[PDB]
Design a protein around this motif. Structure first.
Motif, PDB file in Angstrom:
ATOM      1  N   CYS A 178       0.919  -1.091   0.010  1.00 55.98           N
ATOM      2  CA  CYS A 178       0.142  -0.003  -0.045  1.00 55.98           C
ATOM      3  C   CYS A 178       0.964   1.140   0.045  1.00 55.98           C
ATOM      4  CB  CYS A 178      -1.036  -0.106   1.202  1.00 55.98           C
ATOM      5  SG  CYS A 178      -2.176  -1.041   0.972  1.00 55.98           S
ATOM      6  N   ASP A 179       1.772   1.327   1.028  1.00 57.67           N
ATOM      7  CA  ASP A 179       2.597   2.551   1.307  1.00 57.67           C
ATOM      8  C   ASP A 179       3.460   2.956   0.196  1.00 57.67           C
ATOM      9  OD1 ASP A 179       4.268   4.465   2.332  1.00 57.67           O
ATOM     10  OD2 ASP A 179       4.636   3.397   4.482  1.00 57.67           O
ATOM     11  N   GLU A 180       3.994   1.950  -0.703  1.00 60.90           N
ATOM     12  CA  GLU A 180       4.634   2.168  -1.800  1.00 60.90           C
ATOM     13  C   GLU A 180       3.982   2.140  -3.236  1.00 60.90           C
ATOM     14  OE1 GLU A 180       8.784   0.865  -1.718  1.00 60.90           O
ATOM     15  OE2 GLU A 180       8.882   1.718   0.268  1.00 60.90           O
ATOM     16  N   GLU A 181       2.647   2.159  -2.980  1.00 59.37           N
ATOM     17  CA  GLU A 181       1.456   2.125  -3.897  1.00 59.37           C
ATOM     18  C   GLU A 181       1.856   1.158  -5.152  1.00 59.37           C
ATOM     19  OE1 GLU A 181       2.808   6.498  -4.540  1.00 59.37           O
ATOM     20  OE2 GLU A 181       0.791   6.880  -4.128  1.00 59.37           O
ATOM     21  N   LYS A 211      -2.781   4.813  -0.196  1.00 61.10           N
ATOM     22  CA  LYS A 211      -3.002   6.065  -0.696  1.00 61.10           C
ATOM     23  C   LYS A 211      -3.671   6.226  -2.085  1.00 61.10           C
ATOM     24  CE  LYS A 211       1.785   7.081   0.076  1.00 61.10           C
ATOM     25  NZ  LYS A 211       3.132   6.568   0.314  1.00 61.10           N
ATOM     26  N   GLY A 212      -4.607   7.116  -2.370  1.00 64.02           N
ATOM     27  CA  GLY A 212      -5.197   7.373  -3.590  1.00 64.02           C
ATOM     28  C   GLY A 212      -6.473   6.193  -3.834  1.00 64.02           C
ATOM     29  N   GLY A 213      -6.380   6.146  -5.230  1.00 65.35           N
ATOM     30  CA  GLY A 213      -7.383   5.102  -5.532  1.00 65.35           C
ATOM     31  C   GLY A 213      -6.952   3.726  -5.381  1.00 65.35           C
ATOM     32  N   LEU A 214      -7.146   3.224  -4.152  1.00 67.35           N
ATOM     33  CA  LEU A 214      -6.754   1.901  -3.541  1.00 67.35           C
ATOM     34  C   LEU A 214      -7.591   1.926  -2.310  1.00 67.35           C
ATOM     35  CD1 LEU A 214      -5.049  -0.540  -4.285  1.00 67.35           C
ATOM     36  CD2 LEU A 214      -3.145   0.273  -2.934  1.00 67.35           C
ATOM     37  N   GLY A 215      -6.948   1.780  -1.064  1.00 68.82           N
ATOM     38  CA  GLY A 215      -7.238   1.800   0.235  1.00 68.82           C
ATOM     39  C   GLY A 215      -8.838   1.339   0.457  1.00 68.82           C
ATOM     40  N   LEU A 216      -9.873   1.654  -0.249  1.00 64.39           N
ATOM     41  CA  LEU A 216     -11.126   1.397  -0.101  1.00 64.39           C
ATOM     42  C   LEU A 216     -11.484   0.317  -1.237  1.00 64.39           C
ATOM     43  CD1 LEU A 216     -11.968   3.131   2.204  1.00 64.39           C
ATOM     44  CD2 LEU A 216     -13.801   4.292   1.163  1.00 64.39           C
ATOM     45  N   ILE A 217     -10.655   0.509  -2.339  1.00 59.06           N
ATOM     46  CA  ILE A 217     -10.862  -0.804  -3.240  1.00 59.06           C
ATOM     47  C   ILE A 217     -10.456  -2.045  -2.518  1.00 59.06           C
ATOM     48  CG2 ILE A 217      -9.394  -1.478  -5.046  1.00 59.06           C
ATOM     49  CD1 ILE A 217      -9.360   1.871  -5.652  1.00 59.06           C
TER      50      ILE A 217
END
Length: 224
Positions: A178-181, A211-217
């Motif tokens: 997640c942290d490094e996207e 971060k961004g368009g992920l997280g809740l994805i």
């Protein structure tokens, strides 16, 4: 260039098999004698990628698990340096797959972080613990997830590596992914069971870190 104060270690490192052959044949004590870095000719042969020299020293029955004073076995060097055939010969003579060096890393750790795909497989078919922890309690998977090595992750998952181990900072592969996207990597990880609940030592879940368009994805992926 001269890498050792012991001749046999220099012949080993430079490829000079025949000279090494004649030298050790003259004195079989030279094959196990250690140098300034507590390394034998086997260590330096592993480093340089001289497979035929390795095979000659293994025939002789040189110990294959002796650690240099950095903690490195021949299998550590071979794996890190990316010597596919030498790693094979080392596992062929029962080299300890799970040996650890001063820094706490096993060979697999060096395989995973340097994308030695074929060597990782060879270590894992050879009984390497996929969940081996370094001194910061980090795994091959932490490295792969953090560096976005998809191929390596698939290898690690197939060999039953956990995806829900915490390093000393309390992060799991998924946290780092997640942290490094790392886009697919985190998706592939939660598809194969990476939790969205464990807390690193900042009350943060992998969701929060994302971060961004992920997280809740990774929550519309686990509630789809």
């Amino acid at each position: 260039g001269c890498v050792s104060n012991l001749m046999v270690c220099n012949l080993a490192y430079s490829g000079k098999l025949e000279e090494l052959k004649e030298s050790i044949l003259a004195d079989k004590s030279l094959a196990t004698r250690t140098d300034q870095d507590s390394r034998t000719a086997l260590h330096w042969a592993c480093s340089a990628g001289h497979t035929e020299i390795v095979e000659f020293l293994l025939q002789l029955g040189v110990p294959v698990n002796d650690k240099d004073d950095a903690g490195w076995s021949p299998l550590h060097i071979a794996a890190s340096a990316g010597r596919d055939e030498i790693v094979k010969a080392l596992l062929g003579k029962g080299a300890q797959v799970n040996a650890v060096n001063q820094n706490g890393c096993t060979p697999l750790h060096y395989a995973a972080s340097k994308n030695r795909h074929e060597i990782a497989v060879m270590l894992l078919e050879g009984g390497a613990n996929p969940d081996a922890k370094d001194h910061y309690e980090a795994t091959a998977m932490h490295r792969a997830a953090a560096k976005g090595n998809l191929k390596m992750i698939h290898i690690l998952l197939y060999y039953k590596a956990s995806t829900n181990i915490q390093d000393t900072e309390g992060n799991t592969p998924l946290h780092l992914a997640c942290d490094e996207e790392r886009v697919e990597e985190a998706k592939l990880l939660v598809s194969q069971g990476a939790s969205i609940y464990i807390e690193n030592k900042e009350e943060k879940t992998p969701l929060q870190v994302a971060k961004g368009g992920l997280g809740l994805i990774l929550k519309r992926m686990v509630e789809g």
